[PDB]
Structure formats: C-alpha cells, structure tokens
C-alpha cells in the first residue's frame, strides 16, 4: 500500500529559509515519490548531476537532506562543484565530488513581492572560504584591519549581511529562483529512503 513522506511541504510553502540560515530537513524511513518531480513537473532547470534522473525511483540512498534557498536569477548557476562567486565560498557550499540532485524554479510570486524583503540577506565577508556541508548560523562584525573594533561600527568593521532588494517588477536574470538541493549520502550505512 505504501505511503509518502512529507517531501512536498518542504518544496511548497510561503516563507523559505534564507541564504545563510538555510534549512536542512532530514528525511528517512519513507517512500519519497520522486515521480512527481521529473515525470510530471513544471520546474525549470532540473539538471541534478550525480545520478541519472531516469529510474531515480528504483535506486535509493541512505538519508535525504532537503535544502531550501532563494537566489537572484543570474546567481542560480553558482550551485556547482565549487566554481566561483558569493555562493559556495561564503554561503552554503557544495562539497567536491558530491552526489545528489539540484532543482531551481522561478518564484516571481508566492512570497516574492514589492519592497526589498526584510529577510533574504547575503552571507558575505567571512575570513575563510568555508568548508562543505557546515552551516553558518552566526553573526558578528567582520575584521578588515589592524585594530579590532570593540563592538561599535565605523571605519571598516563591515556588517556581513545585506538584504536582497528585489520585487515583482525586476528583470529576467534577477527575479527570485527558489532552489532545492536534495542531498544523498554515500557511506557504510543501509539505505532508508527507498521505494517506487
């Protein structure tokens, strides 16, 4: 008879995470109906290197890590094995030789409306270039000189985060494109998420 784990509620909703405080939902012990995302779908740019989209339902990995992101139109391509840009260098990073799928669908509506939204800020100005799979839920004034400012901003001492100033009247390569990354795992553990 089977069932279906709440995969879609991660995919559809009004308020999606952020660029740096990105949600990462673990999904296990379910029959995730992958047929709904490729066989009958209206999602642009469903290129999800790592496993062939066909017969995805007949191969199953250990645990699901569902992600969620909001990116400008042009900056969607930064999801790649490292590459360049302000994603995967200070934002969430894609590990090298990673195996999992990536989807990016336009969201000009459904909570992307007039006015630079209060949330949806960058994650910028980190002293290091991050490590894969680690999550940045911390905020503090950056270091950009000899003396460390003691908590009061001024010369240098940049605040890391700046808001996305988008709206439903923007261009073509700058409108929001909500991004979902389904991360598999390859390890010595049995596969949990399985089923037709």
């Amino acid at each position, epitope marked *: 008879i089977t069932n279906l784990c709440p995969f879609g509620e991660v995919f559809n909703a009004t308020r999606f995470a952020s660029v740096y405080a990105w949600n990462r939902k673990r999904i296990s012990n379910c029959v995730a109906d992958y047929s709904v995302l490729y066989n009958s779908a209206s999602f642009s740019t469903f290129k999800c290197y790592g496993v062939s989209p066909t017969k995805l339902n007949d191969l199953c990995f250990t645990n699901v890590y569902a992600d969620s992101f909001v990116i400008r139109g042009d900056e969607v391509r930064q999801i790649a094995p490292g590459q360049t840009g302000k994603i995967a260098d200070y934002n969430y990073k894609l590990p090298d030789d990673f195996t999992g799928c990536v989807i990016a669908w336009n969201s000009n509506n459904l909570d992307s409306k007039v006015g630079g939204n209060y949330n949806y800020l960058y994650r910028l100005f980190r002293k290091s270039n991050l490590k894969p799979f680690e999550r940045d839920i911390s905020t503090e004034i950056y270091q950009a*000189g*000899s003396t460390p400012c003691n908590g009061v901003e*001024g010369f*240098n001492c940049y605040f890391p985060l700046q808001s996305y100033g988008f709206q439903p009247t923007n261009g073509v390569g700058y409108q929001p494109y909500r991004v979902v990354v389904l991360s598999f795992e390859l390890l010595h553990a049995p596969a949990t998420v399985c089923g037709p």
Partner: antibody
Amino acid sequence: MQLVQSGPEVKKPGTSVKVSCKASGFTFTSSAVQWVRQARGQRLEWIGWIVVGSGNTNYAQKFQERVTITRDMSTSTAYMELSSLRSEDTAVYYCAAPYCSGGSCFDGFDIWGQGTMVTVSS
Amino acid sequence: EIVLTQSPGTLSLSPGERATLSCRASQSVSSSYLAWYQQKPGQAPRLLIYGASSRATGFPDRFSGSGSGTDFTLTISRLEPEDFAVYYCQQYGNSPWTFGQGTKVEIRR
C-alpha cells in the same frame, strides 16, 4: 596598484555630473571607496564613503542632498551623481581605497587616484 | 567634532629640525583609527603613520610621532628638503570622517 580617472568634465550651472574611478591592481570585490573635494589653494572636505563590497553609504552635512553614489560592480569602477550643481563646486573629486586582497587588509587609505576637473561655467 | 586646528602654522628651517606638529582633537579619539596624510603641490597625498602606533609600509625614515586622544601629537626629526609640503591630519570611526586644518612648512632664507 594603479587607479585612473576620467577626463576633465565640463557642465552647466545646475544640470548633473558623474565621475569614474577605475580600480585596478587590488581586489575590488571586498574593499571600500571614498570620495573627497579639493580646489585651488583651499582645504579638503570629505564627501562620502562607499563600502563597495556591499553598498552602504553616508554623506557630509552639506552633501546629504544633491548627492548619491553609484555602485557599478562590473568593470571595477565607481560613480556618484551630484545634482543641482552650484558655481562653487569647481573641484577635483579624487578617490581612495585600501589595499585589500584576501579578506583582511590595510587600514590606512593608501591607494589613491588623480581626480578630474569640473568647471560649472557658461 | 571639528575644532582640530593643528597648532603649528608655517615653520621655516633647513634640515637640522627637531620640529613637531600637533593634531588637537575635540574628544579623545580611539587610536589606530587615525591617519596622517601628506599632500604635495600639484599631486595626490600619501600616508605616513596609520594610527599613531606603527609606520606605513614603506616611506622615508627619520620621523615617526604619536600622541594622546585630544592631543595626537607627531614629530619630525631632520628630514630632507624634499618633504616640505602641506600635511593633513585625519580621523576615522565616527561619521562624518573629518579631516583637519592641515600644517604648512617652509625654509629659512
């Protein structure tokens, strides 16, 4: 380590103006840029700073109005429009930037330019 | 915020100087958010001491001075006639980042 500026612009008494500082030789992705005023045989007045890694700016008491910066991330440049040009603005505007490369960088504003020459005459 | 008015005006003597200049302040500013530029006739300025606690990367030697908050003093000790031009103090930290009056130098004749 070079920074070239546009040629001497000529305007009319109160239309507009825009100046360009091309930044080269240092990482312009994460740095800061400032703009000043000068004259002949006169003092220097700070105008407006640009955190250029991510745009956030303020202005001096006489420059809150009639002035706003322009980012233009690509081509590694910087712009600011001055509006309602006044006669006593025959100034060399200059620009400065810290030598930043890698995420942490020098405090003193060490990378400068040469400036333009604007004369709001007939 | 702007009462700096560097005490010296125009001073004139050949090399053989122990001269010093002062950058008085309105309120004692935190050090290392300071600067001391050096304008030149018909060119762009430079940077000499970046915060009264060091010296800049590379510049001619034989002078480096530091002071307190309301008195960010500085000194010059027998520099060559090449370095005879208008100086300009500076402040960081609090907007507006204000500069100073500037100090002028001269030579006995």
